[PDB]
Amino acid sequence: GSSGSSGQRRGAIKQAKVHHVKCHEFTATFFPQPTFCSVCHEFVWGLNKQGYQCRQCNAAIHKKCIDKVIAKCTGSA
Ligand SMILES: [Zn+2]
Ligand SMILES: [Zn+2]
């Protein structure tokens, strides 16, 4: 005779954070389509190439084009 309990466990959180550069929340995102950069103005359709997309203006730019960002964010309603 015996018995046990399935047991309930949680913890599906690794890490959460956002980079604030020139009023832009760049978040590592993978663009499934070819998008032209806003700074260098180059086709961002590279295979296995993580880019950056703001949360407000939603501007797509290369990881290296993160420091070359001057334009300010306008924001969306
Ligand atoms: Zn922005
Ligand atoms: Zn770029």
Delimit the domains of the chain by residue range. Answer: 8-77
Closest CA to 53 of 73, 24, 75, 33: 24
Please tell me the experimental approach by which this structure was elucidated.
NMR
Distance CA 33, CA 51 (A): 12
Ligand nearest to the CA of 74: 1
What single-letter DSSP state applies at residue 25? E
Tokens for 69?
Answer: 């960002």
CA–CA distances in Å: residue 6 to residues 1, 2, 10: 17, 14, 13
Reading the block at residue 1, the tokens are 């005779």
Q: Rounded to the nearest whole angstrom, what is the distance from the C-alpha of residue 54 to the centroid of ligand 1?
A: 5
The beta-carbon contacts of 27-36 under 8 Å, at least 24 apart in sequence, are 27/52, 27/53, 27/55, 28/52, 29/53, 31/60, 35/60, 36/60
Q: For residue 32, how far is its CA from the centre of ligand 2 (angstroms)? A: 16
Query: Which CATH number describes the domain made up of 8-77?
Result: 3.30.60.20
